[PDB]
């Protein structure tokens, strides 16, 4: 059901590599990017499905 969908999503999308990555992001830069060069390099090195 609707509750089962939410439970499965919570179990899957955040099982191992989110319980620390999300916490680090909450304790991260937060503000704007360092330079525009970093953003361009990140966009170049990111996959097409990660830029949408």
């Amino acid at each position: 059901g609707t509750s089962s969908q939410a439970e499965a999503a919570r179990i899957l999308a955040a099982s191992w590599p989110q319980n620390r990555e999300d916490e680090e992001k909450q304790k991260l830069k937060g503000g704007p990017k360092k330079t525009k060069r970093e953003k361009k390099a990140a966009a170049s090195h990111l996959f097409p499905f990660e830029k949408l």
Partner: protein, 604 residues
């Protein structure tokens, strides 16, 4: 020699760092070469090192090569002399050659041309310039069985004697242990005994400069020597073989792996050699286009080495084939030559030059060393990074995206250990969702997708769930051919599934996306071949593995060949927009239902 930090330090061994850093090279005492790519003399140093040593890794900045006895044999086979190579290595050292390499190089290069093997009148002979070496090897027990009947003196002219044809592999293995390696030189310019054919490639099939270098190294002083050329599948590999066959100008025999590769080679010959169909023959027990009296013959393995009863027509064809010399016997997918029955194939036919072609020279069981004497030395090793920098090879963006194990599956994975856990991490629901998301995304962006998946039992429910074409493998010949033929030129269908069938050199069309799930354990050859099916960021391929399982270790240990080739595997841990759309196994009910059907094997 010292182990202060566990690292072999050679600071005192090679202090010749005169002035000052202009030589982009480092030598090792035991043996190793480190080359700096960011040098103005990079191309010349690379050309010098290729002709003398084989690479061990080619990253973007600091290449590493290895010095081996066979590499030095190949170097001295070309017009390069001992003095030239020694003085040029000393020229670009920046540290001074240690006094363990010069002695090693001298010892390797001294005994190169002392012993030669020749074929004449369907007879194998071993000829030596120095008569003493014959008496040196006379006391060897293994050699004495080759002569029959004992070959009392075989007085000719230069001392030579006959050897047993079927025991040539044994003497080839023994000679290198005796520090007298054999050389396979075919001086096809002047034979006057062998009936050369009128093959001549059309003057319209241009070849790239690296193919020019490989062919030029093949024919160094007007003669052809047996060797191995390693080129990517997407790059021009059949063209090199066709050009070599045309240059040899003799009766050619081509050996493939599958029953469809022979058609591929026939098409390549008809495209780039201008040969009449009467001379071209294929001997694979399908049409039998009169192989008797032919110029070029194409066949496959597992047919020339049958240990069982053979067909009547095939028996006569083999009897005819084993009664004449062959020019430039070409082997395809040479990596799987060192087998129980494939090794004897070279001993069942007689040929002057044996040219092996492959894309993935890596193999387990450390049997590649045997290939050094089975055929010859590793002649050319193409640099994949610079090959894709020129734009002629698609720059594939490698990805290693893993998925967590679902709770309903990890308990069973840790519960069972007797080979029953393969299906558990093979059919991971999270991996299934990731694969489905990738399929949908790359279909929305209109990219051809090839999904490799071993363990076809899992592939059944993996493919029928999405209702997409798949190749079980033991289906038929027409169905696979028609599926692969309509895969390319059809906008409606642009994704196919292959189960260990595409792990060889086939005619698969151009694709941009490859997704491999649950392949073999540590088959670097298989992963390299699968990667080769994509290149021909134009393209990119993904590998899906399950965390906290043996598949992680398998993926880690199978990608080392590609990182040696220069590729980098980016790790993807989150998929953007995974929850944006609906995917299969959304709820836990079907996930836990999957356990029963995945444990329903019970192969006991």
């Amino acid at each position: 020699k010292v182990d202060e930090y566990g690292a072999k330090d050679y600071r005192l061994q090679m202090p010749l760092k005169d002035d000052h850093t202009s030589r982009p090279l480092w030598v090792a005492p035991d043996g190793h070469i480190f080359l700096e790519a960011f040098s103005p003399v990079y191309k010349y140093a690379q050309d010098f090192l290729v002709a003398i040593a084989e690479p061990v890794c080619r990253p973007t900045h600091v290449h590493e090569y290895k010095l081996t006895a066979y590499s030095l044999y190949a170097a001295v086979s070309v017009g390069l002399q001992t003095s030239d190579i020694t003085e040029y290595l000393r020229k670009l050292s920046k540290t001074g050659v240690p006094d363990g390499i010069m002695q090693f190089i001298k010892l390797c290069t001294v005994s190169y041309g002392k012993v030669k093997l020749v074929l004449k009148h369907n007879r194998y002979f071993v000829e030596s310039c120095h008569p003493d070496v014959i008496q040196h090897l006379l006391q060897d027990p293994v050699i004495r069985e080759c002569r029959l009947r004992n070959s009392e003196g075989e007085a000719t002219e230069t001392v030579s004697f006959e050897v047993k044809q079927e025991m040539i592999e044994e003497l080839q293995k023994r000679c290198i242990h005796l520090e007298y390696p054999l050389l396979a030189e075919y001086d096809f310019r002047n034979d006057s005994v062998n009936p050369d054919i009128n093959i001549d490639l059309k003057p319209t099939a241009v070849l790239r400069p690296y193919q020019e270098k490989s062919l030029r190294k093949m024919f160094g002083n007007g003669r052809a020597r047996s060797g191995v050329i390693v080129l990517p599948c997407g790059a021009g590999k059949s063209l090199v073989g066709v050009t070599a066959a045309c240059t040899v100008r003799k009766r050619c025999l081509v050996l493939g792996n599958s029953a469809v590769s022979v058609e591929q080679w026939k098409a390549q010959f008809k495209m780039w050699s201008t040969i009449d169909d009467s001379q071209i023959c294929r001997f694979t027990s399908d049409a039998k286009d009169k192989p008797i009296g032919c110029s070029v013959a194409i066949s496959t393995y597992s047919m020339l080495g049958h240990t069982t009863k053979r067909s009547w027509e095939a028996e006569r064809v083999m009897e005819w084939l084993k009664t004449q010399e062959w020019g430039l016997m070409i082997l395809d997918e040479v990596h799987t030559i060192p087998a129980k029955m494939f090794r004897r194939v070279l001993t069942i036919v007689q040929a002057h030059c044996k040219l092996g072609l492959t894309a993935t020279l890596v193999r387990e069981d450390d049997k590649i060393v045997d290939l050094n004497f089975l055929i010859g030395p590793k002649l050319y090793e193409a640099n994949w990074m610079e090959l894709q920098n020129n734009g002629y090879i698609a720059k594939v963006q490698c990805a290693e995206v893993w998925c967590p194990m679902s709770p309903e599956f990890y308990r069973e994975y840790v519960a069972i250990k007797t080979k029953k856990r393969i299906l558990l991490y093979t059919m991971n629901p999270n991996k299934f969702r990731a694969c489905q998301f990738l399929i949908k995304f790359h279909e929305r962006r209109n990219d051809k997708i090839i999904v490799f998946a071993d363990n076809v039992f899992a592939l059944k429910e993996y493919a029928i769930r999405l209702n997409k074409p798949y190749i079980y493998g033991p289906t038929s010949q027409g169905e696979r051919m028609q599926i692969l033929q309509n895969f390319k030129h059809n906008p409606k269908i642009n994704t196919i599934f292959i189960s260990k069938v595409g792990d060889t050199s086939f005619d698969l069309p151009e694709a941009n996306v490859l997704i491999q799930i649950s392949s073999h354990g540590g088959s670097r050859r298989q992963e390299a071949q699968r990667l080769g099916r994509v290149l021909r960021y134009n393209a990119f391929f993904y590998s899906l593995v399950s965390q906290d399982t043996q598949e992680m270790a398998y993926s880690t240990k199978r990608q080392r060949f590609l990182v040696d080739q220069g590729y980098s595997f980016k790790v993807i841990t989150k998929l953007a927009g995974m929850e944006e759309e609906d995917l299969a196994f959304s709820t836990k009910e079907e996930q836990q239902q999957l356990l029963q059907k995945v444990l329903a094997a019970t192969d006991l």
